[PDB]
Amino acid sequence: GAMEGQQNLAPGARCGVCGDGTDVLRCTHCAAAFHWRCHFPAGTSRPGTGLRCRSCSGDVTPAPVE
Numbered sequence: 250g251a252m253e254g255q256q257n258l259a260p261g262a263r264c265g266v267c268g269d270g271t272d273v274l275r276c277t278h279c280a281a282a283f284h285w286r287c288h289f290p291a292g293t294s295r296p297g298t299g300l301r302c303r304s305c306s307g308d309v310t311p312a313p314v315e
């Protein structure tokens with residue numbers, strides 16, 4: 250219906266900065282739960298192409314495919 254996301258509170262996965270897991274973002278390269286602004290408060294823009302946590306955003310160098 251419209252209440253399948255009622256328990257959006259990930260088990261053992263919440264924004265450590267807030268304590269809440271309400272509308273918490275997930276990492277695509279690993280498993281994580283955080284709010285973008287809570288991890289990247291430097292004015293970093295949230296990418297729609299691959300949500301990346303702090304660790305996964307450390308080294309991001311793609312392989313030049315020709």
Ligand SMILES: [Zn+2]
Pocket residue numbers: 264266267268283284287
């Ligand atoms: Zn937060």
Ligand SMILES: [Zn+2]
Pocket residue numbers: 276277278279280281301302303304305306
């Ligand atoms: Zn990650």
